[PDB]
Design a protein around this ligand. Structure first.
Ligand SMILES: Nc1ncnc2c1ncn2[C@@H]1O[C@H](COP(=O)(O)OP(=O)(O)OP(O)(O)=S)[C@@H](O)[C@H]1O
Lengths: 172, 398, 63, 127
């Protein structure tokens, strides 16, 4: 699912910058993926930034040292509004439920907020070895989602992947 | 090449045909291993919507065709007169495929290959029908005769034919009709009223024929009774029965010859005393003979592993088929003895009619052994004494 | 009190155009009944949020 | 309100036929949902709900049991919708309940060949 999850986070992050208009609509385009019309981008700097993101996020996906990998909508001053939590117990039927997550995102700056039990120091140094961009430990104001609506957006107990996603968000 | 597969769908099962076909094809391709029949399955749908799967003559080939059938539950409908509704016609009406007919085609055992000839006959009939051959130029009377010794399963083969044909040829005719004709209830004899009665039942046959999407089999028992030999019989005392009741059937059957979804099946006992102008109007007059030694052994097997299947003979010993005895070359051994003794019974029980053969286990477990559960070689001994009991009983009635 | 079978005094529905399923009425009976439900499991995320641990934020922003 | 409830039963029955490429994103009731473009199915489900319509004009009703059949038409699954019939988040909340239901649970073969029933907002599934 490494490739499958990687492309899913790509199509995700485009839908994320699409649906709540934090960026203009015209920037992103569309193509066809997972038998689903999906929203994509081709802008260079974002393309390579997300590229580094995914080929730096794959080994946490394989080794499974992550309680939950999150994608967070951030403001220009790093003010989170929506966290998207991958509460993942990773130990033919899988991709179809990722179609289901695609729908769910349609009906659910930015950062890759990786909740790990260990310190981000290994991950940080790893970011500055597969990217020039430095990774830092998340501060106080970029994590606190006050009044969290604990609604489970969509869970999958697949024999290949125990995967549950939901948006940690305020009352909104 | 080609192999045929038939699968029992349950009546309380109502899934669509193509889902059943896909599921059975899936089971076959997953397994893809002789003529054995599946009974064990591993899919809740397929269990609640199938009863069994069977191969009819160990190979992983995929030259597979599926025939799916439903043996109809209710038995026979009755046919009575139009205005003399009491008893005039009283013909039997099976709406095939029918429940009381299954397993029948398998049980029967012959040694002249009647099954294949008499099935590929109808297959070639359909081939010549679909190719639009000049019916004025190459034709068939659609009448098949079977004659031979009494009690030797002559008539059994006709019901098996009809069942196997309405099963094999499904989706080509939605169903089949089988009309069993009583050739003894159409002899109301006072000055050619029977020769007028044949006409009404044959019009009803026409009624069941014009339904051009139903394959119909007309089974006539004792075809010697309806068609008595008129010529050689130097009896002018026969006023109009020997001349106006045979001539009243030699026309109604030459009338259905034009149609194509009809087949006439007839069972006879006496080879003579039948009209020479009806031993030309039958395509196949095949003789069903009394069982022969290998056939007797196979029937006795069928009976014995039937009893073992129902646990009558509790200690299950492998009964070795005659091919394995030929392979070993008749070598006495602690398991091979029972098959040998069976084979001695087979020569000793030679010349009996199939019906008494399929009775003999009943008697051998009736008088000689009262045990609700029997060990082998005593039951076998019970057979070897009951056969001589049958010889002496036949000698008793002179 | 009433059940309808868009395929107790039952008001079935036929729509004669669809009529391939040679035996309809017995199919119609099956659709009506209840049968053993599985419990609606009160769900729980397995790896919850511990406030003593802080996550990872990369610096860069989209253009 | 019975009419708009019937249109939400449309949303349900057919999006749950979804919840593959013969389906498409379009605006329904001011949300984008990925259903089918089929006009025959569109008007057929409209007909199902508009024959359910006089039924709800009776006001005597218990469930709208949208039975997701198997291919055998002999339920290995089902979706009873026992709404005790007397803003966008809640008109989407129902859809998220059914999505999380099919989430913990699982769907059926692609063509679910479902036959809507009625027994004359809450739900569950007899699997
Ligand atoms: N050759 C055979 N092989 C195996 N089973 C037989 C054989 N012949 C007869 N049977 C059994 O005999 C039983 C009935 O046979 P019948 O067909 O009624 O005999 P039959 O030939 O009708 O005799 P008639 O002509 O009506 S007296 C069936 O249950 C058959 O299984």
């Amino acid at each position: 699912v490494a490739d499958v999850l990687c492309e899913f986070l790509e199509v995700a992050v485009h839908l994320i910058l699409y649906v709540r208009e934090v960026y203009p609509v015209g920037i992103f385009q569309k193509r066809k993926k997972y038998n689903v019309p999906v929203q994509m981008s081709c802008h260079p700097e974002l393309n390579q930034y997300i590229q580094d993101t995914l080929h730096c996020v794959k080994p946490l996906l394989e080794k499974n040292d992550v309680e939950k990998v999150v994608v967070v909508i951030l403001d220009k001053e790093h003010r989170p509004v929506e966290k998207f939590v991958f509460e993942i117990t990773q130990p033919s039927h899988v991709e179809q439920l990722l179609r289901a997550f695609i729908l769910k995102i349609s009906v659910c700056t930015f950062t890759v907020l990786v909740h790990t039990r260990e310190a981000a120091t290994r991950n940080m140094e790893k970011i500055q070895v597969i990217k020039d961009f430095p990774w830092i430990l998340a501060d106080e104001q970029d994590v606190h989602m006050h009044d969290p609506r604990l609604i489970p957006l969509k869970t999958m107990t697949s024999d290949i992947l125990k995967m549950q996603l939901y948006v940690e968000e305020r009352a909104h | 090449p080609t192999v045929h597969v038939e699968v029992h769908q349950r009546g309380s099962s109502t899934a669509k045909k193509e889902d059943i076909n896909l599921s059975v094809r899936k089971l076959l391709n997953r397994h893809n291993i002789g003529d054995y029949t599946w009974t064990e399955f591993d899919e809740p749908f397929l269990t609640r919507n199938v009863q069994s799967v069977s191969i009819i003559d160990d190979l992983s080939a995929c030259t597979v065709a599926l025939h799916i059938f439903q043996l109809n539950e209710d038995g026979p409908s009755s046919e009575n007169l139009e205005e003399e509704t009491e008893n005039i016609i009283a013909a039997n009406h099976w709406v095939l495929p029918a429940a009381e007919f299954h397993g029948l085609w398998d049980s029967l055992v012959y040694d002249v290959e009647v099954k294949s000839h008499l099935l590929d006959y109808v297959m070639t009939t359909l081939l010549f029908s679909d190719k639009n051959v000049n019916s004025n130029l190459i034709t068939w009377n659609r009448v098949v005769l079977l004659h031979g010794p009494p009690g030797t399963g002559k008539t059994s083969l006709c019901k098996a034919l009809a069942q196997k044909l309405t099963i094999r040829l499904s989706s080509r005719y939605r169903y089949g009709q089988l009309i069993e004709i009583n050739s003894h209830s159409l002899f109301s004899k006072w000055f050619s009223e029977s020769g007028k009665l044949v006409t009404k039942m044959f019009q009803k046959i026409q009624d069941l024929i014009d339904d051009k999407d139903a394959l119909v089999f007309v089974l006539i028992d004792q075809v010697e009774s309806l068609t008595a030999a008129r010529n050689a019989c130097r009896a002018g005392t026969e006023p109009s029965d020997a001349i106006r009741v045979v001539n009243a059937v030699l026309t109604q059957i030459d009338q259905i010859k034009r149609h194509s979804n009809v087949v006439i099946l007839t069972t006879s006992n006496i080879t003579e005393k039948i009209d020479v102008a009806f031993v030309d109007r039958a395509d196949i007059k095949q003789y069903i003979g009394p069982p022969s030694a290998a056939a007797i052994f196979k029937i006795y097997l069928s009976c014995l592993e039937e009893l073992m299947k129902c646990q009558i003979i509790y200690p299950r010993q492998q009964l070795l088929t005659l091919r394995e005895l030929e392979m070993i070359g008749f070598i006495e051994n602690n398991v091979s003895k029972l098959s040998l003794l069976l084979n001695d019974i087979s020569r000793k029980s030679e010349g009996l009619s199939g019906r008494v053969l399929r009775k003999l286990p009943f008697l051998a477990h009736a008088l000689y052994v009262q045990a609700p559960t029997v060990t082998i070689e005593g039951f076998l001994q019970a057979l070897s004494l009951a056969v001589d009991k049958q010889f002496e009983e036949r000698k008793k009635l002179a | 009190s009433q059940v309808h079978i868009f395929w107790t005094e039952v008001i079935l529905h036929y729509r004669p155009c669809e009529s391939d399923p040679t035996q309809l009425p017995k199919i119609a009976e099956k659709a009506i009944q209840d049968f053993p439900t599985r419990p609606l499991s009160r769900f729980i995320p397995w790896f919850p949020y511990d406030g003593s641990k802080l996550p990872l934020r990369p610096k860069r922003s989209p253009p």
